[PDB]
Amino acid sequence: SEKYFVKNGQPHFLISGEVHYFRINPKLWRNHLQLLKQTGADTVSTYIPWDWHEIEEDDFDFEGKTHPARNLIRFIKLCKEENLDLIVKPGPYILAEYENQGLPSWLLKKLSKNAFALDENGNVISPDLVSYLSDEFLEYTFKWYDKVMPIISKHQKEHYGPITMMQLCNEIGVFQWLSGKSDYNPKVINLYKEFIIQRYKTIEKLNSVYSTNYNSFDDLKAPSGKIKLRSDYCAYFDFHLFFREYYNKYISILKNKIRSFGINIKLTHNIPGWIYGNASELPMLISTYSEIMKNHPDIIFGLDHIPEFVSFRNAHSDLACNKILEAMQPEAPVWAAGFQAGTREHHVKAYAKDLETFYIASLAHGIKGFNYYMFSQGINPEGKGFYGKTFYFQTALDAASNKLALYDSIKKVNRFIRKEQKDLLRTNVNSEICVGFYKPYFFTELISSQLLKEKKLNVEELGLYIDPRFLREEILFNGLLRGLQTLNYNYDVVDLENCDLKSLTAYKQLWITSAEFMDAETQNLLSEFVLNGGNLILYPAVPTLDNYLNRCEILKNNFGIEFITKDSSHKVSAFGIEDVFTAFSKKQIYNDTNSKPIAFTQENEICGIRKKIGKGELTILGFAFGYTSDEHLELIDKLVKLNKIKRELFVSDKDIQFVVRENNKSRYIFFLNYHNERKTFNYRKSEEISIAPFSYKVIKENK
Amino acid sequence: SEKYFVKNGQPHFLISGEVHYFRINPKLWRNHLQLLKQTGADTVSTYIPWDWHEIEEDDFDFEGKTHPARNLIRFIKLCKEENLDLIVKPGPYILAEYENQGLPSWLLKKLSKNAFALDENGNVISPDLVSYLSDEFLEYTFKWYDKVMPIISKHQKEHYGPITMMQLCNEIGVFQWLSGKSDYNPKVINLYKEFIIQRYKTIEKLNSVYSTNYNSFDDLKAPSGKIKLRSDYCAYFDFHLFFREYYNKYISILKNKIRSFGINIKLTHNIPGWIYGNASELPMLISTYSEIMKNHPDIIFGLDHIPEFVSFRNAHSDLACNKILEAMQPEAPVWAAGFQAGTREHHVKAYAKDLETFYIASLAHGIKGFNYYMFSQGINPEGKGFYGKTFYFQTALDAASNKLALYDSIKKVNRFIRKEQKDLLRTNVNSEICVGFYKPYFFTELISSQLLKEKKLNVEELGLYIDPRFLREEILFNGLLRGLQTLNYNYDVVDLENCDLKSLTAYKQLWITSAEFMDAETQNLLSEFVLNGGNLILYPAVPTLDNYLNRCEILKNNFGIEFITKDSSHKVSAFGIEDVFTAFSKKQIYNDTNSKPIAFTQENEICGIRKKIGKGELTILGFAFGYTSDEHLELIDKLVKLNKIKRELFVSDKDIQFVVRENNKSRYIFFLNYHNERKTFNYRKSSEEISIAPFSYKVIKENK
Ligand SMILES: OC[C@H]1NC[C@H](O)[C@@H](O)[C@@H]1O
Ligand SMILES: OC[C@H]1NC[C@H](O)[C@@H](O)[C@@H]1O
Ligand SMILES: [Ca+2]
Ligand SMILES: [Ca+2]
């Protein structure tokens, strides 16, 4: 049932350390590799920077002819000699605070204006930022691949060499995330038009969806600036779908070119999204890769986990991310390609004693492998560093291979993992709760994000009151998911797109955080789920619109729901819990025919009901609660207990988090103390223990 | 020397605890007051909520006639019986996680639209957000004061009651700030117009400053939407000056009303600005009080410190805020009207072990008094909680008066303070470094802030590149101030407005973080500072504009500086430090003339020089750095060492923070470990061994 890496036909915990050969004194390459191996790590990970090896146009150095740290061949030979597998990341983009993000200076100087990402006024966005499908950019990328890929091919695992995985580029679309700005290159806008024409066939079909009045596709302009009309919302929605297809076209081009050298190893890509030690935006980045993930079984996405600290302030970020990736990529292990080791930023401390707790929490939260980023600090050679001489701080090893405090923490965690991995990797949590992932609420990197200062999406201007980013961040991520983890209730996430009914029927409850819009397919899926005997929890809105904000009331009509939207005090009562804070004065007030009222406004109007539909049960709440009070945890607890779901343990201290992972034979209880307080507690199944601040205890049980 | 509170002409550390009588069973009021007093607290603090006591329009209960917890009179008499002084805070706003921020439900339903703060389109920003000088709002506020102020007056200290201080309203502008919109109410528009006419006298004069072509004052309106022209920037700048006079007018109206009741006690106000456990926007909000603090010597402002956690992530916020309050209120003690105790919200934990370290760091950082907020948890009666039934968590006492973990932390801190307050309050740190506080860089709450929904200020549109908010947040607050604290160099902050030359000459170094604009008066003061023998460190720009972005080259000409602004790599070399990352491509490029070049671009162009001018020294860096790399701390350290400024102690672990506070008689060494690491280090005065737990402190007293 579990997905995990395999070595020597056994469950293998992938333990990789990022070591940038091009940022380390080559005299000390062997020493770094031996210290990495001595932690019990099995793999080493590195970029192969285009700029570093194509030193001038068509002048390649992979042998240290011009600088000993250009000796990639020797670095590969050292990995083999020190029995480390190798992950290679040849770009073309590598990011990683390398000048020009790893693209050669000589390339950027000589490319035409046409090869750059362009703003809506035809201006160069950044002297760094190419257009991914620029003819010129891809021609030079191919010429780089023509030299680096035969080296990778020779040393790939399917030729019994050390190279087990290769990353394609780095964080495709990251610059559209960081800026909130799309590439308006005429070549991209032409691919957008083909996408639109392909999707709608005729201008009449598009007009009826968008409510536009184009005489042809020639009158259709790429969306830009603020959404003022529903037609603008429609155009931006399809512009977001277009970019997911665009990224799939870019990564497919690179992949086919890589496969042409007989490279048959696993390909990777990695997902950023952590901001100031929380990851509530990372699901938006996962959503940018939806079309790659449906079209490429053979590309494994991993997570760049950057918690910065380990406390109740971010305890919930890593589980939610792991759970959502698992929903989007169920056939591949969940693994952290960028697993924080040290800090990218000197002024943002990474404490060994924090990260050690995060490493063990990551095991409780289902991680199957990771790549310590950065295991080894780096020194940028000769003006190659974007931001300073030094690359990362408080790592396992400094750039000179000095052991730092994190080294002993990684050795301790790695020893536990190696000891347990055969049982641990085959354990799962028993989840009787499923939480829906509705991808369209996440498709807003160009109009609404924590990185966009100026919002282009203001739902009030469209006659709506539930913002999909507020819903997915405060009601879902920081709300329900945070609530369930705090209450020590196991949950799974499911991708609602082309979701199989049978895969929902395993759960005692499905929870859906709904805005006022939801496509017919999902409305239909949830209708069938309940009618066939599923228990559905839905809030804060029964949807009445589809993704284009055209009328779609399938779920409402199938469930016999009638409501009016009315203003009331922010607080409601729900299941006899008084003073439940809700986010909106506007609430759905339900007709209660054939329904049990279970929630009331201050004026005693009915803003939540329970009813039987077919063989199933429906709980709808016409109001938005996250987790900003103890009443919110009481409400989540009452809802879970409607279907008599139980925690795996009774723990005396409610502020101790636990995860029970088991298979037929083995049980692991992970206790996690996210608080600055020594806690003593006892536990028993549904026996006294002390945990230091910001710390952990793992207890094993043979069943 | 030091500002501190006194009682019987002795240094007294003000120790208050916040106890909301309205949120506690009145049968337990005495038990809360006794337990507060047993910690060594001398004072109890509370809101008197308008909504709680005017139960319906013109129906008042201060005696517990309709609800026992409405017996304000009995609470006042218990404070007297239990020998606590009382701070009262009757609003009209209290915030306090109370429904409608403490304003009565019946008021907000009764008020016409023009009582409310309105956006640019004339719509109500928020149903509990009033326009402060609304005739209707002040009418009902006055009727509330008519009933509560006679009780307060009767129970003052001078009439043998316990009431020693009263807060006027609550964090003026906080509600407007949190809404992310500014107030365009027609009262604001009309008062702005009168302000502009008073300021310019003739349309010709305003046109000469703004570069506009108005025919009359009737053509001009309060600026709205985004700044596109320098004339728009000018209009917003005067709009910021106007809002400072407007907040002065609000608190003047409340103050004159209160005085009319024979209330002679000390009046207070409280400063907002912490959010998510940092305070980089607090200086902006304190700047909105500039006209109050110039006009009201007798109103003592205190800080509302909400750290939430205590780590290197926020170590610098409390010190910078204390220093900035001192710069703006130099004749009163620095004190915390709100001194975090527990958490206002369940999902944001407050640990006794964090907060105990914060209390000790606050002593190190020069705090002279505080009010633990909340000392006592409360339960909201009658659905009065904004966010839920329970008011605060992880406090010193639960609502029932049980001691929680924090109680023992507060007892330990207060015992230290009462044992030492006679010396400690008279101690100073030895600051050889002064940092300039240039208030106009902070005047952006209408156009640019972390909370403001619209970005109205893009300096690039005005042909500028140094954004004043980026400068004050990243180069000053999170940059220089953070760097100096991390490096264990003492600094003072001085308000440059009307600043006395005499008060700058005490320092070895004056540091100015400058944008491209600075008024003639400040340009002249820094000129005279250096000519008379001051040592000036100025970056990232020689300013050449005044506050209206018109030409002002006083400083540039007085310092004999020639520069061109050019693009280069972000990276510079400075003082032999390579790969110093700077925030802007554009840098100032200086001539060689009569100067030592000490910083260079990737093209080896001169972007920093040192020179002797008159009796003084000038270091100018034509580039912006905060603290986002190890190179930045190395650069700050190099600049401090230019004038041989030394740390008080050699400490073997650079990540240990210390403060040495001393007077003639006593030395206190504070060690602060802001890191999740047990640290064993040695130290000596410029060797003793110390082990310090994570997120912990040591205090050593020496008799000299
Ligand atoms: O938000 C916490 C606390 N900050 C300070 C405010 O004045 C007070 O009303 C509030 O309860
Ligand atoms: O956290 C934001 C804001 N909340 C309200 C508090 O009273 C204020 O002091 C604080 O700055
Ligand atoms: Ca799982
Ligand atoms: Ca019905």
- Where residue B550 sits, what CATH number does that domain have? 3.40.50.880
CA of A316: which chain B residue's CA is closest? B347
Residue with tokens 């790549």: A371
Residues A412 and A332 in one domain: yes
Torsion angle of C-alpha atoms A636, A637, A641, A645, degrees rounded to 10:
100
Domain containing residue A653: CATH number: 2.60.40
Verify whether ligand 2 is closer than 6 Å to residue B274 (CB atom).
Answer: yes
- What resolution in angstroms does the PDB record give? 2.0
Range 315-354 of B in CB contact (< 8 A) with A:
345-349, 351-354
Residues A567 and A675 in one domain: no
CB-CB under 8 Å, B633 with A346: yes
Query: Which of A455, A475, A629 to mutate: most B Cβ within 10 Å?
Result: A629
Query: Could you tell me if B4 lies within 8 Å of chain A, comparing CB atoms?
Result: no
Surrounding residues of ion ligand 3, Cβ less than 5 A: A 366, 428
Calpha distance A558→B91 (Å, rounded): 52
Alpha carbon of B384 to ligand 1 centroid (Å): 15
Name beta bridge partners: A372: A17, A339
- In chain B, what residues touch A393 (CB-CB under 8 Å)? 630
User: How many Å is the Cα radius of gyration of chain B?
Assistant: 26
CB B674 within 8 A of CB B695: yes
Q: Which two tokens stand for residue B580?
A: 């110093």
Verify whether ligand 2 is closer than 6 Å to residue B417 (CB atom).
Answer: no
Residues B287 and B371 in one domain: yes
Range 583-602 of A in CB contact (< 8 A) with B:
585, 602
- With a CB cutoff of 8 Å and minimum separation 6, the contacts of A104 are A50, A51, A54, A57
CA of A391: which chain B residue's CA is closest? B629
Calpha distance A105→B639 (Å, rounded): 34
In a domain, B139, yes or no: yes
Experimental approach was X-ray
Residues B544 and B620 in one domain: yes
Atom 2 of ligand 2, residue of closest alpha carbon:
B275
Torsion angle of C-alpha atoms A548, A549, A551, A552, degrees rounded to 10:
70
Alpha helix positions (H), B93-229: 105-110, 135-154, 174-179, 186-200, 203-210
Domain containing residue A171: CATH number: 3.20.20.80
Alpha helix positions (H), A582-680: 630-641
CA of A346: which chain B residue's CA is closest? B629
In a domain, A267, yes or no: yes
Residues A63 and A85 in one domain: yes
Query: Could you tell me if A388 lies within 8 Å of chain B, comparing CB atoms?
Result: yes
Residue among A162, A38, A23, A140 at smallest CA distance from A92: A140
Atom of ligand 1 nearest to the CA of B270: 7
Q: Residue B77, Cα to own-chain centre: how many angstroms? A: 34
DSSP symbol at B502: G
Verify whether ligand 1 is closer than 6 Å to residue B350 (CB atom).
Answer: no
CB A269 within 8 A of CB A251: yes
- In chain B, what residues touch A632 (CB-CB under 8 Å)? 346-347
Query: Could you tell me if A453 lies within 8 Å of chain B, comparing CB atoms?
Result: yes
Q: Phi then psi for B587, rounded to 5 degrees?
A: -135, 160
Instruction: Name the pairing type of β-strands A491-495 and A563-567.
Output: unpaired
| Sign of torsion over alpha carbons A28, A32, A38, A41 | negative
Chain B: nearest CA to A629, how far in angstroms? 5
Cβ–Cβ contacts within 10 Å for residue A587, how many?
29
Atom of ligand 2 nearest to the CA of B275: 1
Cβ–Cβ contacts within 10 Å for residue B461, how many?
14
Identify residue A269 by its one-letter amino acid code.
H
CB contact burial B154-184 (16+ within 10 A = b; e otherwise): ebbeeeebbbbbbbbbbbbbbbbbbbebbbb
CB-based burial label for A660 (10 Å; 0-12, 13-18, 19+): buried
Name beta bridge partners: A54: A60
Calpha distance B475→B537 (Å, rounded): 13
In a domain, B241, yes or no: no
Query: Could you tell me if B389 lies within 8 Å of chain A, comparing CB atoms?
Result: yes
Calpha distance A655→A434 (Å, rounded): 23
Length of chain B: 704
Alpha carbon of B273 to ligand 2 centroid (Å): 6
Atom 11 of ligand 1, residue of closest alpha carbon:
B96
Calpha distance B78→A123 (Å, rounded): 72
Of B424, B443, B470, which residue sits at a domain end? B424
Alpha helix positions (H), B290-342: 290-295, 315-328
Chain A: nearest CA to B703, how far in angstroms? 34
Residue in A388, A675, A694 nearest the CB of B581: A388
Chain B: nearest CA to A595, how far in angstroms? 27
Torsion angle of C-alpha atoms B147, B148, B149, B152, degrees rounded to 10:
140
Q: Please count the CA atoms within 13 angstroms of the CA of B348 that sit on its side-chain side.
A: 15
CA of B455: which chain A residue's CA is closest? A454
Q: Which two tokens stand for residue A683?
A: 């536990």
Residue A4: nearest ligand to its CA? 3
Show the domain range for B530.
433-641
- With a CB cutoff of 8 Å and minimum separation 6, the contacts of A325 are A271, A286, A301, A303, A334
Alpha helix positions (H), B261-401: 282-287, 290-295, 315-328, 352-364
Residues A630 and A675 in one domain: no
Verify whether ligand 1 is closer than 6 Å to residue B170 (CB atom).
Answer: yes
CB-CB under 8 Å, A349 with B629: no
Residues A466 and A544 in one domain: yes
Query: Could you tell me if B633 lies within 8 Å of chain A, comparing CB atoms?
Result: yes
- In chain A, what residues touch B571 (CB-CB under 8 Å)? 383, 385, 388
Residue among A170, A96, A93 at smallest CA distance from A129: A93
Cβ–Cβ contacts within 10 Å for residue A189, how many?
17
Verify whether ligand 1 is closer than 6 Å to residue B102 (CB atom).
Answer: no
Alpha carbon of A562 to ligand 4 centroid (Å): 6
In a domain, B388, yes or no: yes
Calpha distance B22→B39 (Å, rounded): 22
Q: Which two tokens stand for residue A404?
A: 């730092």
Atom 2 of ligand 1, residue of closest alpha carbon:
B344
Residues B261 and B320 in one domain: yes
Verify whether ligand 1 is closer than 6 Å to residue B344 (CB atom).
Answer: yes
Residues B287 and B142 in one domain: yes
Residues B364 and B476 in one domain: no
Residues A320 and A403 in one domain: yes
Calpha distance B597→B609 (Å, rounded): 4
A-B Cβ pairs (cutoff 8 Å, strict): 123
Atom 7 of ligand 1, residue of closest alpha carbon:
B170
Residues A271 and A365 in one domain: yes
CB A249 within 8 A of CB A183: no
CB A657 within 8 A of CB A486: yes
In a domain, A660, yes or no: yes
Query: Could you tell me if B388 lies within 8 Å of chain A, comparing CB atoms?
Result: yes
CB-CB under 8 Å, A571 with B383: yes
- With a CB cutoff of 8 Å and minimum separation 6, the contacts of A643 are A432, A508, A509, A535, A617
Residue in B354, B380, B627 nearest the CB of A347: B627
Calpha distance A182→A188 (Å, rounded): 10
Gaps in chain B following residue numbers (C to N > 2.5 A): 686
- C-alpha separations of B399 from B395, B402, B410, B580 in Å: 9, 8, 17, 54
The edge-to-edge listing of strands for the beta sheet with B666-673 is B657-662, B666-673, B696-703
Report how many domains make up chain B.
Answer: 3
Verify whether ligand 2 is closer than 6 Å to residue B275 (CB atom).
Answer: yes
Torsion angle of C-alpha atoms B190, B194, B199, B203, degrees rounded to 10:
90
Query: Could you tell me if B205 lies within 8 Å of chain A, comparing CB atoms?
Result: no
CB contact burial B262-295 (16+ within 10 A = b; e otherwise): ebebebbbbbbbbbebbbbbbbbbbbbbbbbbee
CB A545 within 8 A of CB A517: yes
Chain A: nearest CA to B401, how far in angstroms? 20
Of B598, B615, B641, which residue sits at a domain end? B641
In a domain, A117, yes or no: no
Query: Could you tell me if A475 lies within 8 Å of chain B, comparing CB atoms?
Result: no
Of B424, B442, B459, which residue sits at a domain end? B424
Residue in B393, B602, B675 nearest the CB of A349: B675
CB-CB under 8 Å, A677 with B631: no
Atom of ligand 2 nearest to the CA of B338: 9
CB-CB under 8 Å, B630 with A390: yes
Query: Could you tell me if B312 lies within 8 Å of chain A, comparing CB atoms?
Result: yes
Alpha carbon of B251 to ligand 1 centroid (Å): 19
In a domain, B305, yes or no: yes
Query: Could you tell me if B571 lies within 8 Å of chain A, comparing CB atoms?
Result: yes
Verify whether ligand 2 is closer than 6 Å to residue B451 (CB atom).
Answer: no
CB-CB under 8 Å, A353 with B694: yes
In a domain, A481, yes or no: yes
Verify whether ligand 1 is closer than 6 Å to residue B111 (CB atom).
Answer: no
Calpha distance A551→A545 (Å, rounded): 5
CB B358 within 8 A of CB B309: no
